[PDB]
């Protein structure tokens, strides 16, 4: 890939720096499609009504079904549209206007029907995809189950093969299932017994295609979520569900591979999605920061609001660059393994979303704190972004450990920039220096720790952050250089937004790379362990009151 | 360790 | 004071380092007052009911009046309790269990009847205070007006003296007035004409005591706020309100002084209000993280949750230190001008509140995003803390300019650590070095910029941040030294927290002081201004789409 | 200045 070789201290060009170019014929088709979709989303979608009622109106859902937005990436041979990943990221920006639709649609497309596409047979695709893309059926992804006195990640769902060997019987329960009350097709993962030449009782995860018509599938009332009220998040229980043997994704026991393929292949469009939201904020708060007077001056004339606007623009620029760079590497012929970059995009996008949305709400002062403005609702909606599609601190271990796998194999085996425009020369040298330092530090970390690196989750948080910054420092150097070369409109703004982010990210990486050394006096990792250990063994705040007085 | 845990992040290093 | 001479590079180790000690009798008195209050707040107060209904029940308000919480700082001679500044911060932590009550009470005590206490005559206090402290009457602070085609800070309220010279007639309108629908006594500020020997028509701000019984006082429906739904925030309109001439706070034209006094008196206690709420988060979230399994381990055994708990504890420790240090400097005989420290406490407390509340909600994952847990409500409630009692970016300018004015006077006039415990020796040297560097940098800034420093809002932000960090360092050093000296229980934990915060603050201040130089390449403020100016003159995002093409 | 904006933060520094 590209990120896995960053751990080795090498920059893999000819894959990242020539920015993904879309042919003129393809751009016209996507604009022709976006026309009606953007017109519908700007006019006929009532975000306030959906939020206050907690239910997406049936007319809106039917009109969305007419647009074919439920089968965006489904191949055209199966009643879908067959849009590429870049052409899907483009649509993700104009769909995010509601927030409750960008979650219902993503949970049905990105994880819902993605299993049948990735692992389903040619006869399963001909049966479920034509009706999943048409919007008549809705798909759900059932992996997690409620932890009650048990491990939160283990799967206790059971699938017993029948006496006559004609269908499995499924028993279990799942929680946090999006579209649980609407879905008619479930991609359920359950542990089934497998017997081999060893004669053991080894059980393996297997993916099923469970229909609500199979019987025994029951879902509870929808949960009272903070922000995304229009989404239908229920919990689904399968009580003796009879699943025909032909309704198995891939092969029996080979369900871990499918679950890894559905989850990893996604989240990249999130970076565009939130970007499509962030720009909207810049188009609203500015209209408030330029028509309002304070101290006989515009609000736009004060430095502390100008910093907010510049930060929002820089965040949106880096997010768009990351998303389209990732989607361009996913459109290459064959099957590329780009899963670290998707987690990078998700983490950066969620953090920027939270920070920028809160800061935009702060711009309006007390007027943005009420329910009469579209900033309260946006503030509540973007909080799920740090929990949706994977918790942000889970993905940092995924980013750090997956790349340390790649560096580990190469290290053990080994033991036993004239593409960026000349104007962007002060930021490419910083990128090269940071990449070389990151490679050296990763080698040192692997040598010092080794297989124990699992325990050190504070070391892996700094590795996952330097690497996230390194991906944003190359997505904005590829885009800005392309803008200079082609000569797009106001490319000087792009250069300013690329040189400003590169300096800040270089400083951040320079600080973090100093804390990954044995002799760092600024490393607060041993002191954090003691304080937190004492707090958690007491399960309460320890320090006495400042007014306390002993004898 | 159960295989499903690796869906979060790799539990074991090949080192 | 302390902060004002911090600008000169001098540490006044006579008012801050011997931590405020409270004698045994006062501690017993405050503990005796506690009990009937803490039990009532933990048991008889339903935060969920108040939030969902949007109205504080009449029984709860009646019991609050019975407990005497509406007259905490009213002198005992006027039906109050006469509690000091270190005994009001103590009760703030207990009161903070609701959010909708810590705002109703504070807006009636800190900015409400506080005007009559500070500037009212002995005959005005004998008339309004006995019924304001008993809870029969409620006070409101009416300063701001709705900006509609006019400046958002100037006063358009008018008070015309009558023909017979017996009462003023008030006309105006105020917005965002807390307790607008409940208050019977209003402290209204209006511009009235004053004629002098010059014979001009110069108008000055004057404070009034406006009763709802005066007639012509009307208010609208309450605002639909995000978090504090139990509060009553209305807008009050005065239409030909006849105010007797005796109901003037101080003297006619002396309304700016009274407004400044009220605004600056009531910001120190926020840090203990939130630190009493952060400590509540470290108790429930610790229980959740210690009673839950993931990857065959406790959630408390993972480094990325231990860092969150340690950060929460460090924030709470620094907040309590700041609040009690400020309240101890305010309890000295006379009248100290410790108004910068209150703004420091407010800014630090609000930022820490937002960050820690969001991070604690992130600890629980998707369970904390629902309305069945007390983290959604807390997340919505602590967002007003960055707006309530002064916006956080206004207060940074207040701190920086108030300190730089004193520094300018001192420089123009001139031109024309043995208290800390030896274990806290690595953190006192950092504090002294940062103070000396801050003094040198402030002198350099005053020399280079002069009166232009008023416009540079990005330099003042860094100055305010450095000063806030210095205040945090000195507060935690004083508290830790006192804890070691007296020998309180678990003082090693206090030392660990103090050292960690001092190291972090020293690094932050080193970076900020590095960014406050003419030849600093890390300084991005000539580039932020250009980007923000372009964005605001276009009033939209400027950079073209990554898929854009040019012939 | 209308000597009212000084409440938010001091203005017209006398240096």
- What are the Cα distances from residue C136, in Å, to C68, C70, C117? 11, 9, 17
Per the CATH hierarchy, to which homologous superfamily does domain A6-13+392-518+525-530 belong? Butyryl-CoA Dehydrogenase, subunit A, domain 3 (1.20.140.10)
- What are the Cα distances from residue A189, in Å, to A86, A113, A147, A550, C81? 30, 14, 16, 59, 64
CA separation for the pair A474, A506 (Å, rounded):
12
CB contact under 8 A, C402 and D11: no
The SS3 call for residue D2 is coil
Closest CA in chain A for residue D11: A295
Pairing between β-strand A185-193 and β-strand A233-244 as defined by DSSP bridges:
unpaired
Burial of A85 (0-12, 13-18, 19+ CB in 10 A): buried
The secondary element (H helix, E strand) that includes residue C168 is strand C167-178
List, in order, residues 6 or more apart from C216 with CB less than 8 Å away: C170, C238, C239, C240, C241, C242
Does the domain at residues A24-138 carry the CATH identifier 3.50.50.60?
Answer: no
In 3D, which of A311, A282, A314 has the Cα closest to residue A498?
A314
- What are the Cα distances from residue A275, in Å, to A89, A322, A323, A351, A382? 10, 11, 9, 12, 12
Can you say whether residue C452 is alpha, beta or left, with left for phi > 0 and alpha for psi between -120 and 50 degrees?
Answer: alpha
CA separation for the pair B14, A318 (Å, rounded):
34
Active-site choice (C389, C504, C522, C526): C389
Q: Which residues pair with A344 in a beta bridge?
A: none
The secondary element (H helix, E strand) that includes residue A439 is helix A425-448
Q: What are phi and psi of C297, to 5 degrees?
A: -150, 160
Output Rg (C-alpha) for chain C, integer angstroms. 25
Query: B11 and chain C: CB distance < 8 Å anywhere?
Result: yes
CA separation for the pair C508, C488 (Å, rounded):
30
CA separation for the pair A275, C389 (Å, rounded):
32
Burial of A77 (0-12, 13-18, 19+ CB in 10 A): exposed
Q: What are phi and psi of A393, to 5 degrees?
A: -85, -20
Whether A76 is a known active-site residue: answer no
Instruction: Yes or no: say if C249 and C115 are a contact pair by the CB < 8 Å rule.
Output: yes
Per the CATH hierarchy, to which homologous superfamily does domain A263-386 belong? Butyryl-CoA Dehydrogenase, subunit A, domain 3 (1.20.140.10)
Interface probe for B, chosen from C293, C296, C299 (most Cβ of B below 10 Å), is C296
Identical fold for domains C142-262 and C419-536, yes or no, is: no
Residues of C in contact with D1 (CB under 8 A): none
Please provide the DSSP assignment of A442-462 as one string: HHHHHHHTGGGGGT-HHHHHH
In 3D, which of A323, A433, A348, A399 has the Cα closest to residue A19?
A323
End-to-end CA distance of chain A: 66
Per-residue DSSP letter, B7: G
**Residue-range domain boundaries for chain A:** 6-13+392-518+525-530, 24-138, 142-252, 263-386
Please provide the DSSP assignment of C264-296 as one string: HHSSTTHHHHHHHHHHHHHHHHHHHHHS-EETT
CB contact under 8 A, B14 and A405: yes
Q: Which residues pair with A234 in a beta bridge?
A: A177
Strands (E), A212-365: 217-219, 233-244, 293-294, 297-298
Instruction: Yes or no: say if A192 and C336 are a contact pair by the CB < 8 Å rule.
Output: no
Does the domain at residues A142-252 carry the CATH identifier 3.40.640.10?
Answer: no
The SS3 call for residue C511 is helix
CB contact under 8 A, A256 and B7: yes
Instruction: Yes or no: say if A68 and A133 are a contact pair by the CB < 8 Å rule.
Output: yes
Residues of B in contact with C295 (CB under 8 A): 1, 5, 8, 11
In 3D, which of A107, A44, A34, A35 has the Cα closest to residue A70?
A107
Method underlying the structure: cryo-EM
CATH topology of domain C419-536: Butyryl-CoA Dehydrogenase, subunit A; domain 3 (1.20.140)
CA separation for the pair A91, A269 (Å, rounded):
9
In 3D, which of C405, C406, C360, C351 has the Cα closest to residue C383?
C351
Active-site choice (A93, A211, A389, A494): A389
Instruction: Yes or no: say if A71 and A136 are a contact pair by the CB < 8 Å rule.
Output: no
Query: C461 and chain A: CB distance < 8 Å anywhere?
Result: yes
Residue C356 CB neighbours (<10 A): 25
Minimal C-alpha gap between B15 and chain C (Å): 21
The SS3 call for residue A91 is helix
- HSE-up of residue A31 (Cα within 13 Å, Cβ side): 11
Instruction: Yes or no: say if C483 and A547 are a contact pair by the CB < 8 Å rule.
Output: no
Partner residue facing A536 (CB), from C223, C290, C386: C290
Q: What are phi and psi of C168, to 5 degrees?
A: -80, 155
CA separation for the pair A365, C152 (Å, rounded):
12
Residues of A in contact with D8 (CB under 8 A): 295
Closest CA in chain D for residue C257: D7
Residue A141 CB neighbours (<10 A): 25
In 3D, which of C392, C544, C498, C482 has the Cα closest to residue C19?
C482
Interface probe for C, chosen from A546, A547, A548, A551 (most Cβ of C below 10 Å), is A546
Resolution of the structure, angstroms: 3.1
Instruction: Yes or no: say if C268 and C337 are a contact pair by the CB < 8 Å rule.
Output: no
Residue C244 CB neighbours (<10 A): 13
Please give the angle made by the CA atoms of A289, A290 and A293, to the nearest 5 degrees.
85
The secondary element (H helix, E strand) that includes residue C471 is helix C457-486
The SS3 call for residue C175 is strand
Does the domain at residues C142-262 carry the CATH identifier 3.40.50.620?
Answer: no
Residues of C in contact with D15 (CB under 8 A): 408, 412, 446, 450-451
Q: How many helices (H) and strands (E) does chain C have?
A: 19, 9
In 3D, which of C506, C451, C519, C447 has the Cα closest to residue C476?
C506
Query: A527 and chain C: CB distance < 8 Å anywhere?
Result: yes
Query: D1 and chain C: CB distance < 8 Å anywhere?
Result: no
CA separation for the pair A187, A262 (Å, rounded):
10
Residues of D in contact with C412 (CB under 8 A): 15
The SS3 call for residue C486 is helix
The SS3 call for residue A335 is coil
- What are the Cα distances from residue C82, in Å, to A487, C30, C85, C114? 71, 12, 10, 12
Minimal C-alpha gap between C330 and chain A (Å): 15
Q: Where are the alpha helices (DSSP H) in C110-255?
A: 114-119, 122-133
- What are the Cα distances from residue C353, in Å, to A321, C275, C350, C382, C500? 33, 8, 5, 7, 19
Show which of residues 149-178 on chain A sit within 8 Å of chain B, judged by CB atoms: 151, 153-155
CA separation for the pair A154, A147 (Å, rounded):
9
The SS3 call for residue C413 is helix
Pairing between β-strand A217-219 and β-strand C233-244 as defined by DSSP bridges:
unpaired
Burial of C212 (0-12, 13-18, 19+ CB in 10 A): middle
| Crossing angle between the packed helical segments C457-486 and C428-449, to the nearest 10 degrees | 160
CB contact under 8 A, A524 and C546: no
Instruction: Yes or no: say if A103 and A140 are a contact pair by the CB < 8 Å rule.
Output: no
Instruction: Yes or no: say if C24 and C68 are a contact pair by the CB < 8 Å rule.
Output: no
Partner residue facing C387 (CB), from A365, A386, A522: A365
CA separation for the pair A399, A465 (Å, rounded):
9
Q: Which residues pair with C169 in a beta bridge?
A: C160, C242
Instruction: Yes or no: say if A358 and C354 are a contact pair by the CB < 8 Å rule.
Output: yes
Please give the angle made by the CA atoms of A420, A425 and A430, to the nearest 5 degrees.
100
Query: B5 and chain C: CB distance < 8 Å anywhere?
Result: yes
């Amino acid at each position: 890939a590209f990120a896995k070789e960053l751990f080795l201290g090498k920059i893999k060009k000819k894959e990242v720096f020539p920015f993904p170019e879309v042919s003129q014929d393809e751009l016209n088709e996507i604009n022709q499609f976006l026309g009606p979709v953007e017109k519908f989303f700007t006019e006929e979608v009532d975000s306030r009504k959906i939020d206050q009622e907690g239910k997406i109106p049936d007319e809106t859902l039917e009109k969305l079904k007419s647009l074919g937005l439920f089968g965006l990436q489904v191949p055209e041979e199966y009643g879908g549209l067959g849009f590429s990943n870049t052409m899907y990221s483009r649509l993700g920006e104009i769909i995010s206007m509601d927030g409750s639709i960008t979650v219902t649609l993503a949970a049905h497309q990105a994880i819902g029907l993605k299993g049948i596409i990735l692992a389903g047979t040619e006869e399963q695709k001909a049966k479920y995809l034509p009706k999943l893309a048409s919007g008549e059926h809705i798909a759900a992804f059932c992996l997690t189950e409620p932890a009650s006195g048990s491990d939160a990640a283990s799967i206790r769902s059971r699938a017993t093969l029948s006496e006559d060997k004609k269908h499995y019987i499924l028993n279990g329960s799942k929680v946090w299932i999006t579209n649980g009350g609407l879905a008619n097709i479930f991609t359920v993962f359950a542990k089934t017994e497998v017997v081999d030449s060893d004669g053991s009782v080894k059980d393996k995860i297997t993916a099923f295609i469970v229909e609500r018509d199979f019987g025994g599938v029951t879902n509870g009332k929808p949960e009272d979520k903070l922000g995304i009220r229009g989404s239908n998040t229920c919990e689904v229980h399968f009580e003796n569900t009879k699943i025909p043997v032909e309704n198995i994704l891939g092969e029996v026991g080979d369900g871990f591979k499918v679950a890894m393929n559905i989850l990893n292949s996604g989240r990249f469009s999130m970076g565009s999605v939130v970007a499509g939201l962030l720009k909207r904020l810049i188009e609203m708060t500015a209209e408030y920061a330029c028509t309002r007077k304070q101290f006989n001056k515009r609000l736009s004339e004060f430095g502390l609001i100008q910093e907010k606007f510049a930060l929002m623009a820089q965040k949106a620029y880096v997010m768009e660059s990351m998303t389209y760079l990732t989607a361009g590497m996913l459109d290459q012929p064959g099957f590329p393994d780009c899963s670290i970059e998707a987690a990078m995009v998700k983490v950066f996008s969620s953090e920027a979303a939270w920070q920028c949305v809160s800061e935009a709400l702060q711009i309006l002062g007390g007027l943005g704190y009420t329910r009469d403005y579209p900033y309260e609702r946006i503030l509540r909606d973007t909080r799920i972004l740090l929990i949706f599609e994977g918790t942000n601190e889970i993905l940092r271990m995924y980013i750090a450990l997956t790349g340390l796998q790649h560096a580990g194999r190469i290290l053990t085996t080994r033991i036993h920039h004239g593409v960026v425009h000349p104007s962007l020369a002060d930021s490419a040298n910083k990128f090269e220096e940071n990449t070389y330092c990151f490679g050296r530090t990763v080698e040192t970390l692997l040598l010092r720790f080794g297989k124990t690196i699992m325990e050190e989750q504070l070391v892996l948080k700094r590795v996952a952050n330097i690497l996230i910054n390194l991906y944003g420092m190359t997505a904005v150097l590829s885009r800005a250089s392309r803008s200079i070369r082609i000569g797009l409109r106001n490319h000087d703004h792009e250069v300013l937004l690329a040189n400003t982010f590169c300096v800040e990210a270089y400083l951040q990486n320079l600080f973090s790379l100093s804390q990954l050394d044995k002799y760092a006096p600024e490393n607060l990792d041993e002191q954090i362990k003691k304080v937190s250990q004492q707090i958690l063994e007491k399960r309460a705040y320890i320090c006495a009151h400042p007014l306390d007085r002993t004898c | 360790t159960p295989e499903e845990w690796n869906l979060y992040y790799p539990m074991q290093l090949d080192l």
